[PDB]
Design a protein around this ligand. Structure first.
Ligand SMILES: Cc1cn([C@H]2C[C@H](OP(=O)(O)O)[C@@H](COP(=O)(O)O)O2)c(=O)[nH]c1=O
Length: 135
């Protein structure tokens, strides 16, 4: 896998960010993470939806360097969103959320699953500690 630089344009929610990637604004959906939603023509504002959005927003906004890391399968989903692992100053946003109990490991579509084991290890650790989603 290889990380490439990108520039923050705008944070959308817990699992979606808008980035400038190779001179193009794109919507990126965080691989292997499912956060409670703020906006969703599907049941509204789940508990933690707001906390999850806040966490991603602060993390990518206070970063001096943003990197996108594609997995080894398809890099876009059917809605044209890039599918990647995003790093804010060397730290993976996807893992940070799972570790804090603000997301659950979801949507595993092979072969876009390189870090699934690493994230599931983080999820168990957060459940163990009864954090947010798991409290
Ligand atoms: C994370 C991810 C989502 N998607 C699709 C699955 C869902 O499709 P449907 O909308 O057709 O059911 C949708 C969930 O996105 P969100 O969780 O952002 O709402 O995005 C992929 O196709 N591949 C992925 O890796």
């Amino acid at each position: 896998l290889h990380k490439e630089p990108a520039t923050l344009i705008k944070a959308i929610d817990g699992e979606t960010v808008k980035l400038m990637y190779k001179g193009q604004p794109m919507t990126f959906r965080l691989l292997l993470v499912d956060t409670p939603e703020t906006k969703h023509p599907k049941k509204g504002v789940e508990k933690y939806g707001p906390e999850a959005s806040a966490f991603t927003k602060k993390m990518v906004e206070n970063a001096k360097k943003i990197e996108v890391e594609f997995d080894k399968g398809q890099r876009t989903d059917k809605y044209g969103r890039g599918l990647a692992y995003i790093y804010a100053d060397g730290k993976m946003v996807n893992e940070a959320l799972v570790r804090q109990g603000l997301a659950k490991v979801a949507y595993v579509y092979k072969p876009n699953n390189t870090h699934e084991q690493h994230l599931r290890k983080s999820e168990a650790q957060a459940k163990k500690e009864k954090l947010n989603i798991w409290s």
